[PDB]
């Protein structure tokens, strides 16, 4: 099987009648919802860098979509559609079947259409998904906007995926392979969060982008960081390195006034939310453990580091 | 370091019509009224889409150009791009040239670079996403061709294919620096009945129109616009370059005789050639000096 047959078999599997023009032409066409801005992002996953080489193709497909929906969610936007650019060295039908099932399972979970892409023979498995969302004009939640006194919160748990990576085969590998983009939470934070970012690199570094953009700092409370029971039972310095510098969480970190936090707590959310600290004037990220200053060195993720 | 790379090479310019550009989790664009989003992505792989020794400036240029070509093929006005680049090492001479190529192409066509992703990976792989806008319902589709419509192509076909087989020749410029026919694409909006850009080869790419439109075509071989260099090579190889060479990134379109006259009255920035006609029976046939002319043609396909 060659390119065109591969696209028709694996990447044109569903009807999306609410899309003006899907797969089959030089470009896709989307009629915007009225009074909304386009929200758009792209993230690349490289085999052996963003996932273990032995990762199941279904997980690879899932995560390729999920990490991009996470950046849409981080703006407060509603995700709509994706493009899929996949480059791989050989036609492997078992692999293509699993991969495309992963793409579509993630798309279907979050109501997203696959409307276009590019299919390429290349020496090393590389996937770039583009995600498209829409938001009420002017209402995006930015990385700027955090104010002194705002609570710092994070969704779900942090550190799971990083622990999983260092313990392949452990149950927590599921959080590495199958992160959950917090799509509904992102939408529910529109109008409530004063700033937001998704946690791809590690809580400390990604919160750091908010702190820099907003020209503020934060004090975080280590015993409040939401970690898995498994990490609660390991050495605390190791625990907090996973939680704060592990990365691969794809949770949402956001700031919010006490006032708006009470409003948020009144909503029915599909993920837990944990208040983990507060924005301060001092432009430094500091940590405390049960009332005591806690010195902590955190190495962040960067390509070519 | 990744962050300094983005700031030095890929965040070089300010852009008038972008609600939110580089620096956040996503970019934000305010649509023009009564217009649809037109969106596409194309990947270039080193050693597959370009010779390994290709200059970084040409790699950057072509990375953008091929994506603007797909926007143009819809009749749409390009607006912005995303750049996803994966590469094994930081090479500042390479990155400077590559960036300059990206921005030279963007600037020539009034396009903003508004986001992307920068990655360390074993093999140079570039995926640009292009975004444009078009009056709702006025996209030129592959599916609109009608019996009796003229078949036309812009510019020259076969140049880039010849250039690849004769690296160092002047025609290598058409391999390294294809020209996306942005203005012609826009001017065909409301005139062309169907359109496609010729990335794979005229015969195969016209074929996509024929299949989508459920029609056939008869092409006139002596009318194909080839370079003077190709007129000098024996005709079988000439036809193969012209029809199956690929990498042209010209526009192939169908148009009624009446609308063709209207098109001719416009001032275009590129040559246009009538090369045949849409017919009822659903096959592609070639004609040479008034006679049917059998040709075996294979357009480009990955994994074939
Ligand atoms: N992996 C993929 N997933 C979804 N759509 C895809 C994929 N690969 C290609 N497509 C779509 O299939 C169609 C044909 O792609 P392609 O032949 O590469 O177009 P072009 O030659 O105009 O770039 C396009 O509409 C493209 O968006
Ligand atoms: N090569 C590039 N060209 C243009 N913009 C880029 C490029 N790489 C990254 N960006 C932009 O730089 C910002 C930071 O990117 P990144 O740190 O990867 O964000 P995230 O962690 O949210 O995915 C984003 O706004 C992204 O779109
Ligand atoms: C094999 C393997 N090694 C290491 C990691 C850990 N890892 C890879 S990329 C990354 C950070 C997130 O990737 P990045 O490209 O920076 O995401 P983005 O900021 O673009 O969303 C981490 C922690 C992994 N998941 N798999
Ligand atoms: C080193 C090298 N080998 C071969 C070619 C020729 N070539 C590579 S890809 C291609 C077809 C166009 O690429 P494709 O990915 O199919 O473009 P798309 O249809 O996605 O726009 C051709 C003719 C080249 N340009 N460089
Ligand atoms: Ca990335
Ligand atoms: Ca991301
Ligand atoms: Ca990162
Ligand atoms: Ca391609
Ligand atoms: Ca293309
Ligand atoms: Ca092709
Ligand atoms: Mg095309
Ligand atoms: Mg393509
Ligand atoms: Mg992000
Ligand atoms: Mg990124
Ligand atoms: Na991204
Ligand atoms: Na494309």
CA distance A23 to A47: 26
Q: Are A113 and B112 in contact (CB under 8 A)?
A: no
CA distance A190 to B95: 38
- Set of chain B residues whose Cβ sits within 8 Å of the Cβ of A89: none
Q: Quick one: DSSP state of residue A299? A: P
CA distance B128 to B122: 18
Q: Between chains, do A304 and B5 touch, taking CB under 8 Å as contact? A: yes
Query: Which residue out of A3, A7, A13, A121 has the highest number of ligand 1 atoms within 8 Å of its CB and is therefore the one to mutate?
Result: A7
Provide φ and ψ at A260, rounded to 5°: -70, -25
- Name the nearest CA neighbour of A231 among A218, A249, A210, A206: A249
Give residue B251's Cα distance to chain centre: 7
- Name the nearest CA neighbour of B299 among B202, B158, B175, B230: B202
CA distance B273 to B29: 37
CA distance A20 to B2: 37
Torsional sign, CA B40, B44, B49, B50 = positive
3-class SS letters over chain B:
CHHHHHHHHCCCCCCCCCCECECECCEEECCCCCEEEEEEEEEEEECCCECCCCCHHHHHHHHHHHHHHHHHCCCCEEEEEEEEEEECCCCHHHHHHHHHHHHHHHHHCCCEEEEEEEEECCCCEEEEEEEEEEECCCCCCCCCCCCCCEEEEECCCCHHHHHHHCCCCCCHHHHHCCCCCHHHHHHHCCCCCEEEECCCCHHHHHHHHHHHHCCEEEEEHHHCCCCHHHHCCCHHHHHHHHHHCCCCCCEEEEECHHHHHHHHHCCCCCCEEEEEEEECCCCEEEEECCEECCCCCCCCCCCC
Q: Are A158 and A220 in contact (CB under 8 A)?
A: no
Is B248 a pocket residue for ligand 4 (Cβ < 6 Å)? no
* Percentages (nearest 5) of helix, strand, coil residues in chain A: 30, 30, 40
- Cβ–Cβ contacts within 10 Å for residue A191, how many? 12
Q: Which residue has the tokens 């983005």?
A: B6
Q: Please tell me whether residue A248 adopts helix, strand or coil conformation.
A: coil
- Name the nearest CA neighbour of A28 among A96, A118, A92, A109: A118
The atom of ligand 4 lying closest to the CA of B301 is 16
Provide φ and ψ at B100, rounded to 5°: -60, -40
Interface with chain A: mutation pick from B9, B127, B246, B300, highest number of A CBs within 10 Å: B127
Task: List C-alpha distances in Å: A8 to A11, A74, A125, A257, B141.
Answer: 6, 32, 20, 49, 19
Q: Are A94 and A159 in contact (CB under 8 A)?
A: no
Q: Are A41 and B25 in contact (CB under 8 A)?
A: yes
A37 strand-pairing partners = A135
Q: Which residue has the tokens 């812009």?
A: B154
- Residues of A at the annotated binding site? 24-26, 43, 50, 71, 117-119, 143, 198, 200-201, 248, 301, 303
- Name the nearest CA neighbour of A127 among B84, B68, B95: B84
Where does residue B206 fall: left (phi above 0), alpha (psi -120 to 50 degrees), or beta otherwise? alpha
CA distance B290 to A134: 55
Q: Please tell me whether residue A10 adopts helix, strand or coil conformation.
A: helix
Q: Please tell me whether residue A38 adopts helix, strand or coil conformation.
A: strand
Query: Which residue out of A12, A14, A42, A116 has the highest number of ligand 1 atoms within 8 Å of its CB and is therefore the one to mutate?
Result: A116
Task: List C-alpha distances in Å: A213 to A107, A141, A148, A208, A299.
Answer: 31, 13, 13, 8, 20
B36 strand-pairing partners = B134
CA distance A241 to A238: 5
- Name the nearest CA neighbour of A241 among A272, A277, A203, A207: A203
And the tokens for A183? 């799509």
And the tokens for B91? 């090479």
How many whole angstroms from A187 Cα to the centroid of ligand 4?
41
Q: Please tell me whether residue A279 adopts helix, strand or coil conformation.
A: strand
What top-level class would CATH report for the domain A142-296? alpha beta
And the tokens for B52? 């390994």
B213 to chain A nearest CA, in Å? 12
A228 to chain B nearest CA, in Å? 26
- Set of chain B residues whose Cβ sits within 8 Å of the Cβ of A30: 36-37, 39
Q: Are B198 and B205 in contact (CB under 8 A)?
A: yes
- Set of chain B residues whose Cβ sits within 8 Å of the Cβ of A123: 45, 47, 122-123
Domain residue ranges in chain A: 1-141, 142-296
A244, containing H or E segment: helix A236-245
> Which string of b and e fits B150-187 if b means at least 16 CB within 10 Å?
bbbbbbbbbbbbbbbeeeeeebbebbbbbbbbbbbbbb
Is B70 a pocket residue for ligand 1 (Cβ < 6 Å)? yes
Q: Quick one: DSSP state of residue A48? A: T
Provide φ and ψ at A36, rounded to 5°: -130, 150
CA distance A23 to A82: 11
CA distance A36 to B82: 20
- Set of chain B residues whose Cβ sits within 8 Å of the Cβ of A189: none
Q: Which residue has the tokens 């704060």?
A: A244
- Set of chain A residues whose Cβ sits within 8 Å of the Cβ of B91: none
DSSP string, A213-228: HHT-EEEEEGGGS---
Residue nearest to atom 5 of ligand 3 (CA): A50
Q: Are A182 and A70 in contact (CB under 8 A)?
A: yes
Torsional sign, CA A167, A169, A171, A176 = positive
DSSP string, A163-229: HHHHTBTBTTHHHHHS----HHHHHHHTTT-SEEEE-SS-HHHHHHHHHHHHT-EEEEEGGGS---H
- Name the nearest CA neighbour of A305 among B58, B1, B254, B78: B1
- Name the nearest CA neighbour of B72 among A131, A188, A27: A27
Where does residue A145 fall: left (phi above 0), alpha (psi -120 to 50 degrees), or beta otherwise? left
Interface with chain B: mutation pick from A2, A12, A26, A44, highest number of B CBs within 10 Å: A26
- Cβ–Cβ contacts within 10 Å for residue A190, how many? 17
Task: List C-alpha distances in Å: B220 to B143, B230, B237, B289.
Answer: 22, 16, 16, 8
A285 strand-pairing partners = A218
- Name the nearest CA neighbour of A40 among A32, A49, A48: A32
* Determination approach: X-ray
Q: What is the CA radius of gyration of chain A?
A: 20
* Beta strand pairing call for B284-288 and B291-292: antiparallel
And the tokens for A117? 């892409």
| Sequence-ordered list of residues with C-beta below 8 angstroms from that of B296, at least 6 positions apart, any chain | none
And the tokens for B247? 């990498």
| Sequence-ordered list of residues with C-beta below 8 angstroms from that of A195, at least 6 positions apart, any chain | A141, A142, A143, A144, A145, A146, A150, A210, A213, A214, A254, A255
> Which string of b and e fits A52-66 if b means at least 16 CB within 10 Å?
beebbbbbbbbbbbb
Is B197 a pocket residue for ligand 4 (Cβ < 6 Å)? no
CA distance A104 to A114: 8
Q: Please tell me whether residue A45 adopts helix, strand or coil conformation.
A: strand
Helix axes B92-108, B56-72, angle to 10 degrees: 30
Resolution rounded to one decimal, in angstroms? 1.5
What top-level class would CATH report for the domain A1-141? alpha beta
Q: Does domain B141-295 have CATH number 3.40.50.300?
A: no
Q: How many CA atoms lie less than 13 Å away from A180 in the CB half-sphere?
A: 15
CA distance A204 to A220: 10
How many whole angstroms from B64 Cα to the centroid of ligand 6?
22
Equal CATH topology for B1-140 and B141-295: no
CA distance B186 to B263: 12
What top-level class would CATH report for the domain B1-140? alpha beta
Is A11 a pocket residue for ligand 1 (Cβ < 6 Å)? yes
Residue nearest to atom 7 of ligand 2 (CA): B116
Q: Between chains, do A120 and B76 touch, taking CB under 8 Å as contact? A: no
* Beta strand pairing call for A36-46 and A126-136: antiparallel
């Amino acid at each position: 099987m060659a390119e065109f047959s591969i696209i028709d078999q694996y990447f044109n599997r569903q009807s999306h009648p609410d899309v003006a023009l899907g797969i089959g032409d030089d470009s896709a066409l989307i009629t915007p919802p009225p009074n909304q801005q386009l929200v758009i992002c792209a993230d690349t996953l490289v085999a052996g860098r963003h996932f273990p080489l032995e990762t199941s193709p279904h997980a690879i497909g899932w995560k390729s979509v999920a990490v991009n929906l996470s950046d849409i969610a981080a703006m407060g936007a509603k995700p709509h559609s994706i493009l899929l650019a996949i480059s791989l060295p050989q036609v492997d039908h078992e692999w293509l079947e699993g991969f495309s099932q992963g793409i579509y399972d993630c798309c279907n979970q979050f109501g997203v259409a696959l409307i276009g892409g590019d299919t390429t023979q290349g020496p090393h498995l590389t996937i770039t998904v583009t995600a498209m969302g829409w938001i009420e004009t002017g209402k995006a939640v930015l990385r700027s906007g955090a104010k002194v006194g705002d609570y710092v919160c994070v969704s779900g748990q942090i550190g799971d995926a990083a622990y999983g990576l260092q313990h392949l085969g452990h149950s927590l590998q599921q959080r590495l392979d199958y992160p959950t983009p917090r799509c509904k939470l992102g939408e529910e934070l529109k109008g409530l969060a004063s700033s937001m970012i998704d946690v791809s690199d590690g809580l400390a570094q990604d919160l750091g982008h908010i702190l820099k953009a907003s020209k503020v700092g934060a004090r975080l409370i280590l015993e409040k960081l939401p970690v898995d029971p498994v990490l609660q039972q390991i050495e605390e310095q190791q625990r907090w390195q996973y939680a704060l510098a592990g990365g691969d969480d794809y949770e949402l970190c956001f700031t919010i006034t006490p006032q708006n936090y009470e409003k948020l707590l009144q909503k029915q959310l599909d993920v837990k939310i944990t208040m983990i600290g507060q924005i301060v004037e001092q432009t430094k990220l500091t940590f405390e453990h049960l009332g005591s200053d806690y010195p902590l060195q955190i190495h962040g993720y960067q390509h070519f580091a």
